[PDB]
């Protein structure tokens, strides 16, 4: 009907309808969304987080690492240390 009212009815119910289904929908798409933004977010928080745990972590690996470099380090200081103890 071309003569139907096109304006919105302000007399519609403005309150939230409690009879809406409170159960979560199983028909929601379970696949990952490729249309999500792949760019890094510049609006993230650049400040440090004091809420991070300040306590030492006991779950760190206590075993000696075999993947440490076994070759000698040429970048060590070749100069004789003047701060070595000069006493007897």
């Amino acid at each position: 009907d071309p003569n139907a009212n096109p304006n919105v009815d302000p007399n519609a119910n403005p309150n939230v309808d409690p009879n809406a289904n409170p159960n979560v929908d199983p028909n929601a798409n379970p696949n990952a969304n490729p249309n999500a933004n792949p760019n890094a977010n510049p609006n993230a928080n650049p400040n440090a987080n004091p809420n991070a745990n300040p306590n030492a972590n006991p779950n760190a690996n206590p075993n000696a690492n075999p993947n440490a470099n076994p070759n000698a380090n040429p970048n060590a200081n070749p100069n004789a240390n003047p701060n070595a103890n000069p006493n007897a």
Partner: nanobody
Amino acid sequence: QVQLVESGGGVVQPGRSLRLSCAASGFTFRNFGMHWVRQTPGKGLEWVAVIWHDGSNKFYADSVEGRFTISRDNSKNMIYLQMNSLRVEDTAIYYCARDSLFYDHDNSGYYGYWGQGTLVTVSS
């Protein structure tokens, strides 16, 4: 086995605060919305509150609007009902009820599973 157990009942004085807890087991808790149902002798059953699956929306009855607070924690599988400023009219048995037997988009709002209920009485 959808087993619902209320707790935290007792007797309090008017104007004080009471809290009811409801431990739910036997189903995926975070997939369904729960209710609280109140049974007053001489009046019948009356609805109290409802909460969404993830705790987004909360709706209360007129008689308990603004005085009762419903909440949930999907991690311990519990439903809570905080009752502030209790009055003599709030003496009844409170039931922990689940909405629907199973998911149906067009059919929701009926209590498919009830708890045994807890007694809450206020007096001096």
